[PDB]
Amino acid sequence: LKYAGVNLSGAEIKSSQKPGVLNIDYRYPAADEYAYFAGKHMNTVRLPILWERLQPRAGGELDPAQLALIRQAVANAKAAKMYVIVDVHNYAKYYGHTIGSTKVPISTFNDLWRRLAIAFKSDNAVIFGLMNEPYDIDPQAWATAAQASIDTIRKTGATNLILVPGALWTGAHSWYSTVAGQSNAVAMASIRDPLNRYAIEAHQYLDADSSGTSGGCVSATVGVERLRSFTEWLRLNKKRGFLAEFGTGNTVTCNLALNGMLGYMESNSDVWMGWSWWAAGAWWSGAYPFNVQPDAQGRDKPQMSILSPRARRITD
């Protein structure tokens, strides 16, 4: 296990506002947000960004201001000795149209990643999160699109780590679930990387339907149980995994489940390469059960007492 960190939510929000206005509709993290999480022994920030804010026109130039904001985030992270996953937080859609449609051909997705790959070419602090939670594109069509963007990235010469999701919201628990017979288990088995530096990105929540709608957890072992088949799939297919989103509320059962799931990943580090908690960021409401942003006094949230020592075992 190399990477342990947190999602800093803020730049992806209020997606109806295109372009939206910085510091009103959305925000990037302050420099001291990185220092806080580094002080808690995390070495990674996953940074959700909106495709349409970064690239307002298909095949067009990256927006200068949005690109500079991401460059600042990377610089801020480096100052705290952290990595940044640039997460194109788009559900495989561009202005609401799914990649592979006539409106948004694969070429449109390729062009985004060509430009991002060039902008951050082989910068070892920067990790490429291809797409957040593809879901209304079937797994085989998604794998073809993902493969095209991987190939495009490598053709730039960029040597960065790439995180490759499946479709069906890339749930670890649903890796064998089907859309007209097609599954991530089949579709993602044939993924290749010309430079062989990637991991399969999975998400996992511990509430009733794994949607992360509720702060409660089903059981003290439900995390481990929902990672198990995905873990053996990774092992059989000679692939590595990154748990790029997971979260649990502040309950006794959730605490046992969280601890167990984090321990399980370190015990299976032949395939598990990293994780990043969902979420922190300055604009989460007080009721948000997974929020690990420190409070107005700078005090740690409850779940950090588990996340921090687990991160330390990874990063120290």
The CATH number of residue 162's host domain is 3.20.20.80
DSSP state of 92: T
Distance CA 232, CA 241 (A): 11
| Cβ atoms of residues 254 and 217 within 8 Å | yes
| Cβ atoms of residues 83 and 125 within 8 Å | yes
Distance CA 84, CA 128 (A): 9
The identity of residue 22, as a single letter, is: L
Distance CA 90, CA 87 (A): 9
Instruction: Please enumerate in sequence order all residues whose Cβ is within 8 A of that of 4, keeping only pairs 6 or more positions apart, or say none.
Output: 41, 42, 43, 44, 274, 275, 276, 307, 310, 311, 314, 315
Q: Which domain holds residue 23?
A: 1-316
Kindly tell me the burial class for residue 263, based on how many C-beta atoms sit within 10 Å of its own C-beta (0-12, 13-18, 19 or more).
middle
Give residues after which the chain gaps, C-N over 2.5 angstroms.
Answer: none
Per the annotation, the verdict on 245 as an active-site residue is yes
Instruction: Please enumerate in sequence order all residues whose Cβ is within 8 A of that of 119, keeping only pairs 6 or more positions apart, or say none.
Output: 62, 67, 71
How many domains, the chain?
1
Distance CA 282, CA 305 (A): 20
Distance CA 42, CA 35 (A): 10
Distance CA 72, CA 8 (A): 14
Helix (H, G, I), strand (E, B) or coil at 153: helix
Resolution (A): 1.6
Catalytic residue from among 12, 52, 201, 245: 245
| Cβ atoms of residues 184 and 168 within 8 Å | yes
Helix (H, G, I), strand (E, B) or coil at 38: helix
Q: Phi/psi zone of residue 123: left (φ > 0), alpha (ψ -120 to 50 degrees), beta?
A: beta
Alpha-carbon torsion (215, 253, 250, 173), positive or negative: negative
**What stretch of H or E contains 84?**
strand 83-88
The identity of residue 226, as a single letter, is: R
Distance CA 214, CA 242 (A): 23
Per the annotation, the verdict on 12 as an active-site residue is no
118 C-beta neighbours (distance < 10 Å), count: 13
| Cβ atoms of residues 42 and 6 within 8 Å | yes
260 C-beta neighbours (distance < 10 Å), count: 18
Catalytic residue from among 12, 33, 52, 133: 133
